[PDB]
Amino acid sequence: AMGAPKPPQEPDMNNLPENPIPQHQAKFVLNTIKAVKRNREAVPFLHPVDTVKLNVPFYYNYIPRPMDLSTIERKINLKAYEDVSQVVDDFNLMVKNCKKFNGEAAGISKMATNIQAQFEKLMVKVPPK
Ligand SMILES: CN1C(=O)c2ccccc2Sc2cc(NC(=O)[C@@H]3CCCO3)ccc21
C-alpha cells in the first residue's frame, strides 16, 4: 500500500514577503539554528524525514506539513519569514510532527523535546524588532 506523496519543499519561493525579518534578528536566529544543529540530539532533525528510508508509507497522510532544521535554516537564508515568531512556529511544528507520528513516549520524541529546550533557552536572548 502507498500513502500520500511528499509535499512541495519549503519555502514556497513564490510567496516570500517583501518585509522579511531585519538582518540583525535574522542573523541571530540563523546562529541559533546552527547552534542547535551542533547538538548531538539534533542529528535526526538535520534533514527532512525520509519516509522511504524509514519505511513509513503513511507519514505524509498524518504529517501534511513536514519540517526540519535545514528547512528552517533555508527559510531564514532565503528571507521567507516576516517575524521571529514564525521561526519559533516552525520549530514547534517540527517537534509536534515528531510527537504526533512517533508518540510522546518514543526516544525520538525525547530528542525533539531536548533540542526544543535548547532552542527556547537560546531564543531568550533574541534582539527586539
Ligand atoms: C525525526 N524523525 C522521525 O520523526 C521519524 C519518523 C518516522 C519514523 C522514524 C522516525 S525517527 C527519525 C530517524 C531519522 N533518521 C535516522 O534515523 C537516520 C537515517 C536513517 C537511520 O538513521 C530522521 C528523522 C526521524
Author numbering: 190 to 318
From the publication, what sentences describe this entry?
BET proteins are chromatin-associated factors that regulate transcription and chromatin remodelling. BET proteins bind chromatin through their two BDs (BD1 and BD2), which specifically recognize histones acetylated on lysine residues. The BDs from C. albicans Bdf1 (CaBdf1) share 31–46% sequence identity with human BET BDs and 58–66% identity with those from ScBdf1 and hence are likely to bind multi-acetylated H3 and H4 tails. In conclusion, Bdf1 BDs are required for the viability and virulence of C. albicans and can be selectively targeted by small-molecule inhibitors without compromising human BET BD function.
The most active compound was dibenzothiazepinone 3, an analogue of 1 in which the cyclopropyl, oxadiazole and pyrazine groups are replaced by smaller methyl, carboxyamidyl and tetrahydrofuran groups, respectively. HTRF and ITC assays showed that 3 inhibits CaBdf1 BD1 with low-micromolar affinity and three- to fivefold selectivity relative to human Brd4 BD1. The crystal structure of CaBdf1 BD1 bound to 3 shows that the compound is slightly rotated within the binding pocket compared to 1. Consequently, in a structural alignment with Brd4 BD1, the steric hindrance observed for 1 due to the larger Trp81 and Leu94 side chains is largely relieved for compound 3, explaining the reduced selectivity of this compound. (Both enantiomers of 3 are equally active, consistent with the lack of interaction between the BD and the tetrahydrofuran ring). Liquid culture assays show that 3 has little effect on the growth of C. albicans strains expressing either WT Bdf1 or Bdf1 inactivated in BD1, but significantly inhibited the growth of strains inactivated in BD2, consistent with the specificity of compound 3 for BD1. A dose–response curve revealed a cellular EC50 value of 35±7 μM, corresponding to a 20-fold cell shift relative to the IC50 value determined by HTRF in vitro (or sevenfold relative to the Kd by ITC). At this concentration, compound 3 showed relatively little cytotoxicity towards mammalian cells (EC50 >100 μM). Our chemical screen identified a dibenzothiazepinone compound, 3, that selectively inhibited CaBdf1 BD1 and displayed antifungal activity against susceptible strains. Specifically, strains expressing Bdf1 mutants in which BD1 was the lone functional BD (mutants bdf1-bd2Δ and bdf1-Y425F) were sensitive to 3, consistent with this compound's selectivity for CaBdf1 BD1, whereas all other strains with a functional BD2 were insensitive, arguing strongly against a potential off-target effect.
